[PDB]
């Protein structure tokens, strides 16, 4: 009878950097997606595996709500089968992903006057992330022939970099808040159900 705490996720006052993205396990609750359906101002709302028209008719063993901030231009990367700094080094969906991706422009919240430089992304990595892998390491990245020994310099780089969210920025350089709902189905009791 108690609704799933989608509010806690979507309406959170603070959001995670994409490199250190956040997870909320959602279980043992009714999922009324009408809280999402009645928002006309999400910039994207796409489901993979299920039609979004069926969400209220469906049950899952759990739902995971991954949330973070990226630039406008990078929101197309939060989809199965994408590549780029975000898909490759920050947050990776599986090719057979079942769930929904929702994003909205957050310039109103995530840009201050001096510019907001708190949100980071990973710029360099030895290899691409597996799906739902998460790396929060700050190992100096060895780009060249020669080793680094945790000291920075030529071909030895800090792996993270601030987004600069200035309120003057173009759409593609404005912050977007993203929530990824992963619908998990196991040989187990369905603990997350629509209101039928």
């Amino acid at each position, epitope marked *: 009878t108690n609704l799933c705490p989608f509010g806690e996720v979507f309406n959170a006052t603070r959001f995670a950097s994409v490199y250190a993205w956040n997870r909320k396990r959602i279980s043992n609750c009714v999922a009324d997606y009408s809280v*999402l*359906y009645n928002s006309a101002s*999400f*910039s*994207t*709302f*796409k*489901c*993979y595996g299920v*039609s*979004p*028209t*069926k969400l209220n008719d469906l049950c899952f063993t759990n739902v995971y709500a991954d949330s973070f901030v990226i630039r406008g231009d990078e929101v*197309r990367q939060i*989809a*199965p*089968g994408q590549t780029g700094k975000i898909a490759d080094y920050n947050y990776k969906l599986p090719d057979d992903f079942t769930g929904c*991706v929702i994003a909205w422009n957050s310039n109103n919240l995530d840009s201050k006057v001096g510019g907001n430089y708190n949100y980071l992304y990973r710029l360099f990595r030895k290899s691409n992330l597996k799906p739902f892998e998460r790396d929060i390491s700050t190992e100096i990245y060895q780009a060249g022939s020669t080793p680094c020994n945790g000291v920075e310099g030529f071909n030895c780089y800090f792996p993270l970099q601030s987004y600069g969210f200035q309120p003057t920025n173009g759409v593609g350089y404005q912050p977007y808040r993203v929530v990824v709902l992963s619908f998990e189905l196991l040989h187990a009791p369905a603990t997350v159900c629509g209101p039928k």
Partner: nanobody
Framework: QVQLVESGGGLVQAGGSLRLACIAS????????MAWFRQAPGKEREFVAA????????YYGESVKGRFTISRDNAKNTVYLQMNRLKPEDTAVYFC??????????????????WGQGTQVTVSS
């Protein structure tokens, strides 16, 4: 980088019928939601229809509900748009569109990554 190619456009009588086709390059058509949009003279791109992966939800614009039928054949990497009982308001360029994802906002052109150049349909009286 799917490419889409529309066809079947041309001249047709009011009341007449016409089937557009769109073929997608690539080998993953099964995983693409396919849509048709159109642009009539002096207006924006307007949503016509869309089909989910299974075909199992289809969508239609208010103006075309009843008259137009969208369908897909995964074997031929083709989406179809059967247009029946055609009106002059149907005169427009028909654009095929595709995305991995099925949007709640299915009428938004921004919710589709991939776009054909369009086929011209003209309805006379």
């Amino acid at each position: 980088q799917v490419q889409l190619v529309e066809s079947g456009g041309g001249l047709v009588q009011a009341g007449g019928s016409l089937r557009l086709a769109c073929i997608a390059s690539g080998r993953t058509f099964h995983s693409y939601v396919m849509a048709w949009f159109r642009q009539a003279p002096g207006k924006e791109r307007e949503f016509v229809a869309a089909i989910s992966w299974s075909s199992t939800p289809t969508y239609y614009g208010e103006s075309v509900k009843g008259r137009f039928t969208i369908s897909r054949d995964n074997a031929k990497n083709t989406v179809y748009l059967q247009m029946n009982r055609l009106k002059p308001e149907d005169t427009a360029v028909y654009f095929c569109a595709a995305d991995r994802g099925e949007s709640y906002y299915y009428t938004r052109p921004t919710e589709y990554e991939f776009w054909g150049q369009g086929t011209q349909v003209t309805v006379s009286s």
